[PDB]
Amino acid sequence: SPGIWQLDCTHLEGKVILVAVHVASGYIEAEVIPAETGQETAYFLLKLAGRWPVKTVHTDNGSNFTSTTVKAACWWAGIKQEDGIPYNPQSQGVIESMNKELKKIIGQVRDQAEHLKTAVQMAVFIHNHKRKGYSAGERIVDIIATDIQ
């Protein structure tokens, strides 16, 4: 579970926000892309896996699971690519809630930047630093450090 991430794609302002959630901590990375292609998704995962020890990614949809470019990225980065079937129905609700939370934060910062990508990164910052009391950022580091040790 320290190495398990879940992809999530949401929409805003006619653009796509691609999110990777670290399941055990709720920590996230996100980017704005024009559309969710296999190439965009592959590049995003390459970035993520160079930054955190990504063992497994539950893809966000069947097209990214199928994509040979995505599978090639997962091969490259040593990632086990898996489906995102919510065998635990709670997975669904957690992601849905996270998307609503993220959109709320983006609205709260939206006027502090011209470009959506800027607001999304501000939203990533606020989400990861929010104490719920540890933050998601604190949680992911402790989880992973415990695993190293």
Ligand X SMILES: COc1ccc(CNC(=O)c2ccccc2CN(C)Cc2ccc3c(c2C(=O)O)OC[C@H](CCC(=O)O)O3)cc1
- Kindly list the residues in this chain that would bind Cl ion in the complex (CB under 5 A): 53, 128, 137
Considering only residues 44 through 103, tell me which ones interact with its own copies, judged by CB under 8 A: 46-47, 49-53, 76-77
Q: Note whether 69 binds ligand X by CB under 6 A.
A: yes
Among positions 63, 72, 78, 80, the unique one binding ligand X when judged by CB under 6 A: 72
Burial class of residue 89, CB neighbours in 10 A (0-12, 13-18, 19+): exposed
Tokens of 45: 């995962």
Of 144, 117, 147, 134, give the one whose Cα is nearest residue 51.
144
Of 137, 106, 131, give the one whose Cα is nearest residue 28.
137
Q: How far is the CB of 105 from ligand X (least distance, A)?
A: 14
Say how far apart CA 131 and CA 110 lie, in whole Å. Answer: 22
Q: Note whether 115 binds ligand X by CB under 6 A.
A: yes
Considering only residues 17 through 36, tell me which ones interact with ligand X, judged by CB under 6 A: none
Q: Note whether 125 binds its own copies by CB under 8 A.
A: yes
Beta strand extents in the chain (DSSP E only): 4-12, 15-22, 28-33, 56-58, 80-82
Looking at the Cβ atoms of 115 and 131, the one nearer to ligand X is: 115
Q: Note whether 37 binds ligand X by CB under 6 A.
A: yes
Say how far apart CA 149 and CA 72 lie, in whole Å. Answer: 31
Q: Note whether 111 binds its own copies by CB under 8 A.
A: no
Q: Which stretch binds ligand X (CB under 6 A): 17-25, 40-48, 87-95, 99-107?
A: 40-48
Q: Note whether 15 binds ligand X by CB under 6 A.
A: no
